[PDB]
Amino acid sequence: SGAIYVGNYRVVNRHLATHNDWANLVWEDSSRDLLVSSTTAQGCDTIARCDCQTGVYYCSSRRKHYPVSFSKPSLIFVEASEYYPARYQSHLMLAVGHSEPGDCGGILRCQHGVVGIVSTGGNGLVGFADVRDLLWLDE
Numbered sequence: 001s002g003a004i005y006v007g008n009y010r011v012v013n014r015h016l017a018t019h020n021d022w023a024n025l026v027w028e029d030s031s032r033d034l035l036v037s038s039t040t041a042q043g044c045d046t047i048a049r050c051d052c053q054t055g056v057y058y059c060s061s062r063r064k065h066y067p068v069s070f071s072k073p074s075l076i077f078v079e080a081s082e083y084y085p086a087r088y089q090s091h092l093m094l095a096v097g098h099s100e101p102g103d104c105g106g107i108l109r110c111q112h113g114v115v116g117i118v119s120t121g122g123n124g125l126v127g128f129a130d131v132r133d134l135l136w137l138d139e
């Protein structure tokens with residue numbers, strides 16, 4: 001679990017979104033596993049606007065942060081789950097690291113701010129849904 005709070009927005013994994021998230025829906029993209037809902041309180045997270053390929057992520061299944069090198073956002077095959085059939089997930093970045101299902105929502109950060117959130121795992125890889133292209137989160 002986990003979310004990003006920026007301005008009047010809350011960014012979560014689409015497969016973990018709550019009834020409140022869907023009742024205050026701003027935008028969702030099933031191909032990216034993202035959903036953004038509106039909030040009443042102002043969020044203070046800063047979104048990175050960059051092309052970094054190194055950062056640190058929080059891994060809840062180890063209660064630890066790990067430094068990683070990660071790929072550029074791209075269309076990657078992700079196996080079927082109870083939330084989606086087997087499909088191309090877009091804007092996904094992979095790194096070598098530990099990720100179990102409950103790790104979804106952990107934040108990946110670089111020196112510029114929030115880069116994305118854990119969205120996939122397995123096979124000794126961790127995949128992060130990028131949010132750096134969502135320029136509208138800042139206004």
Ligand SMILES: CCN(CC1CC1)C(=O)c1cccc(CC(=O)N2CCC[C@H](C(N)=O)C2)c1
Nearest residue numbers: 015033078081083084099100101119120121122
């Ligand atoms: C090979 C079976 N296996 C390990 C099971 C745990 C024994 C996995 O598939 C597996 C392993 C670690 C993490 C995850 C989570 C994951 O990647 N998802 C599930 C939620 C939706 C995600 C998405 N963005 O489409 C995809 C799965």
Ligand SMILES: [Zn+2]
Nearest residue numbers: 050052110112
């Ligand atoms: Zn950066």
